[PDB]
């Protein structure tokens, strides 16, 4: 039992599935995919701020007087195949998939009763995208997360509440709470990814009451996790796990379960038609951030943006499949692992540490030129074995008294290494 | 002061402007003008009943999966000129203009806060049609009426209330009452034309409370009139004036102020692109219904349907201008008139009676072949004068003792009569 | 046998069907119906001259960079019913119908082999409009005329010929002659209405050779008529009949068969969406021009403009049906008639004269106030009878020695006259 | 001087630029990019053969009656930046770029006088794509090739010629020859890539006369090359160089200059919106085919398909940039090289031979596991040096008397090799 206050809500232990999942896939999909230009913040940058480049794009691409709601019918999504998406996510090694159900534009990706003619069923796809994706993911035993944005940029009731100093709660009682309850009662989410909370306190958003209901009387009360974006000054302070800031890259080990959210497109979470090759994050950088995040006790949430036709572009597929290929070899050092006592060597070639049971995994991203890996932190016992995940056969190792351990790496010819950018050394019987 | 009950509300006397206005113009305009096929009931006939002809039209005219909300962006209304509309309505002799602010499709023709992205400001015209038309009409001193449909066919909250036996009032508190209050507080209507009430009792619609507020604390509390469509079994029983049934044609004189609503297009209140010439009501039939309605103490509300571009087609303009030309001659027998003691001769060639002050007007629609008009009802005094509105000069008349009065009509050559289908005889000093 | 020179071609007698037809209907239909703004000269006024109003219309109604060819796919014509058109034309009293097969825009309304992807079959309607209309008209025994514009404003080959001083004939051999031969060999026209000839001499257009082929070896060599627009300085000088100038209104009787072409819309031959009621020619003015044209030995060609959906608007239907109603009464004074020796009274109330056999018809457009019609021209014999077409029964008439004939008109009550704007007096046994 | 016959035309020596260019980029771009489904043969597969899948796609994606020409206005190409394209092609190492000016659909990508309203200037892009791309490529000193398809699937004149047994030449004189002359006189192509010739003999296509004019009196008569697709049975028999069959992979060394044309998308030369990652040719396979083609004395033409918006998708950019990165290291073994006397080792790990001057390059695609490369073919002299292109420093080598040469490869650690899939050994002073 939990009471509608933060000290009680924060005492709820997180279900173990989230910490054992490690890797997840983020999907930013909505009406902003129709312009597919700039970012998913298109509407705010165009009308909220009146940026000249967005106005020029609107002038040169659409008739005068074109409004954002006119994008609604053009969100056809006629090539949407949730089974293909789920197969790709399974091949990528993802253990959970978080889909944006409603972004700051206010367009719900499910038939919301309080979003009539501004949802995916009434206009655009004419489908229940949330339900179809959830069915496809549940058939493959992949955990489901629903991203929900609390605020809406131009919703009249939210604007009225903002004018009133957020003393009234017309928007919260009309749209926010009914939509959250509908999203929880149906589709039975495993994860809730809240957003759009930087403008109002948690008292206005009714976050504590909804969280108490979710933890007490909801159909998913047991195996559900939420992030920290439930109001002003609530980020990285209150909630299940801490997203804190976007693309969070902590230096030291945090004392709370956290998650890193990053996008393959470095300049937009939503799809961009004119994405350059230099705007796509490299597979070496993606695997590197994942290794650092898992080593520091965090979850890795990689974002892709589907097109307005419901397609995932081949470059995103290539990145995801490379991540999955790397994971098919090095998963036992990632999935259901916990941080070690050091988590990285401060004197070697970028070595990070994970631990599972009695096994210690050293994931290194740079192959030493001289062919011997130096590991100062591990303490060798008489039953120490080096494995080099992906290669059958033990490795030669010498324990220097004054210096650290020295592991003789297998000198493999080109086009024979198991992975291409990061390698894992497994140590058994090491303190 | 009025209480929220029908006996108190019905005791409010109607302001005299409505009874003195006589002639009004009805405007059915909305998203249904985009298909412009069948009727303004397109959405219900297509999805509510699944009529094969509407499905065939959708198949042959639009891509598969096309939804009604996809019509929203196509309601461009780029040729809308409210000043031209108001000038035409003034030329037609109309004293009040009633515009549909929101029909059963739920699309509001003003920026309604509770109709986000389903209003004329957010999608389609990108204008405030109600406000622009009201400004244009007020500049010309024409009374303004707002048509509001209580029900919406496919609104999720209305469907939920219908499923619950109309015991809940989610739709009323979410959409209906806020929209009515917004429509009254802004645009300050002179008339409220309610509709969409045949499915629910007046208790569900909160009609008595809204009417008490309108009559007590509203900005238009003095000079406002409402019709009788405020709930089930409320038509022709409760309200300001009685529309009763559409195209109401009573035989005897009603004891309550009433209004006849008729459409120039006999098969649709909304605009139809494939309107035939045989579907357009003739000017002789329009003038005839107006004369009968005014004689029987009623108001005449003639309906036109603008195109999705905001244009009134030349045939509707021709009908309205013919009605205005007839009124420029015979207005003093219509405007600010009251029914006489007979209201029609039961033995002559379709003669109807109006009265203003001491003057009695006999409007006849059939020119007698023999050239003498027989009037049994009037009682002639020694100061009796026959005028024949539109022609200067008295008329010869003989009072038969056993029979009635015989008026010698002016034998005019062709292309010399003032009007073309109905003529007015003015009698002064007649009991 | 005829030689390719004007003196030989002009000696061909016209088939009698054209002179006996009298009344015809002109149809201007094409891609210019899609903008439906300004006139059928939209493309030239917009790009040829760069008029600011057309550029403003393009800016406010279509995305930037929109070209005229982009109008092609929008010419859907999905409500085109040629049987309905032919029934309306039969009801209007039309004896021939002339349809624009290709205007100055170059868009052919039939599958022209030399107009690939710029014809009605390839884009837009996806139909053979010329063939369908011809089939519908031939089923009702209505004569068929094909309007063909020689020039095209922006065709590259025509522009090249114009640059070369019209010394080359690339456009004529590539487009003009093959299209004329295809239009004659198929659809077997009864009439050819040439246009677009004011820029080049008849030598450039190969007019004499095509006309010699048409009169010698064509499938319609016997019953075919052509107008006078076959080159520079060819109008009203060379050809079958003389259109001379548009809306030609001669004062005296011409010595050659001529035709008056006029449009119901006074400011456009093509359809205009924003047509005003004041822009529509009145039925009194239409009947008046027809009476004057037939009296002076001419044919009357009335023009209508269908919408881009293939619909004839109700106002055009009303005008045509009024003309047909007038003709159902006064046809025997029009069809297969010839001009008399006077053709109009120079001292009476606008009386025009036709003659058929021994019968002389006096069509008057103004009803005399005193009720007696004065006719100075006719010479009365002892077997003279006045008929007053539309009314059974002879008329009283007195022959003044010094003055002319005086006919006592029937004093009809209102709503009893046969026609409404023009009346015909039939005289038998009159010199 | 050359005469219009094949023995004279085939005797013309090819300019050296084509043989020294080696690597080129093919661009398939046109109206077929608008559907972006199936292949660039969309129109023929949909209407020519009536394949059920294409009909289903048309039914589910476009309104009924939609025609291929209706795709024309949708070819907006609003993100076309030829400078970016040329920069990418320069970065990819391409020495010539061949753009499709007109495919079998008949849509010309330049303002063709004989393709009015079916060209890129009149509809769609409203630009001269050929001219803009040519300007961008010429600024960077990249050779320009124009792909021209002789036949058009549904052009009426071509169909008429086919019906007549190709005895008439209406299509050739109306469209083919004028378009070829316009494409040569303007844009001054360096290469002509003919296609669409498998249906008619070279006599019908007038190929010999056009080629004699091109080689004698054209502005590009000196430095111009053409392929072998100039008529029936002309492929791989007549012309400048031999494309023979698409994706030609000869086993032995041909005796004539040839070119391999291959597409990154294995199932379409045109862009496909639903391209899968498995449909994209791998960079290892692309580099492998290029090495085999250059070794066997051929040119490598890699094809990409831009979107209807004028964009090259990031996966195509990645492939091209990987090819360019490989070439920045191994270019001196490719550019301006000639085949050696062996061209491949028949007993080693896929070694191919090129030669430049006195230097012999052995390009191997498989790294030997034991680290020593065996080369039987080369004959070692006392001044023999092994270089291993990309690595500074000679290599140890031992000449076995009975066996071949054995080169000690540099044992490089992972993430230190110059290339990733193919390596080049340079031998100096070797017979
Ligand atoms: C907040 O939640 C409480 C408890 O569930 C509820 O009673 C109240 O209606 C909610 N307030 C708003 C503004 O929705
Ligand atoms: C009905 O009106 C009353 C009195 O104004 C108000 O208190 C109540 O909220 C209304 N009920 C609904 C369902 O809107
Ligand atoms: C003109 O007609 C003549 C005679 O039919 C024909 O020989 C010639 O080809 C035509 N000229 C052009 C320019 O079409
Ligand atoms: C073929 O080329 C010859 C020589 O240039 C030319 O005279 C002839 O017109 C051409 N034939 C066709 C069918 O274009």
Residue numbers in the entry:
A (entry chain D), B (entry chain A), C (entry chain C), D (entry chain B): 31 to 461
Question: Can you quote the paper on this entry?
Answer:
In humans, the dynamic process of α-L-fucose removal is catalyzed by two α-L-fucosidases—lysosomal FucA1 and secreted FucA2—both of which liberate α-L-fucose from fucosylated glycoconjugates. Here, we have used cryoelectron microscopy (cryo-EM) to determine the structure of human lysosomal α-L-fucosidase (FucA1) in both an unliganded state and in complex with the inhibitor deoxyfuconojirimycin. These structures, determined at 2.49 Å resolution, reveal the homotetrameric structure of FucA1, the architecture of the catalytic center, and the location of both natural population variations and disease-causing mutations. Each protomer of FucA1 is comprised of an N-terminal catalytic domain—a modified (β/α)8 barrel—and a C-terminal β-sandwich domain, which are characteristic of GH29 enzymes (Lombard et al., 2014).
To determine the structure of FucA1, we performed single-particle cryo-EM using a 200 kV Thermo Fisher Scientific Glacios electron cryo-microscope equipped with a Falcon-4 detector. Micrographs showed particles with diverse angular coverage, and secondary structural features could be observed in two-dimensional (2D) class averages. Further data processing resulted in a 3D reconstruction of FucA1 with dihedral symmetry (D2) and an overall resolution of 2.49 Å. FucA1 forms a symmetric homotetramer approximately 150 × 100 × 40 Å in size. Each protomer interacts with two other protomers through residues in both the catalytic and β-sandwich domains, including the loop between residues 441 and 451, thus creating a flattened quaternary structure. We also observed cryo-EM density corresponding to one of the three predicted glycosylation sites. Many of the most frequent natural variants are present on external loops and α-helices; no active-site residues have any natural variation, and very few variants are present on the β-barrel core of the catalytic domain. Surprisingly, none of the missense mutations identified in cases of fucosidosis are present in the active site. The six known missense mutations represent either the shift from a non-polar residue to a charged residue in the protein’s interior (G60D, G340E, L405R) or a disruption of the hydrogen-bonding network of a polar residue by replacement with a non-polar/aromatic residue (S63L, S150F, N329Y).
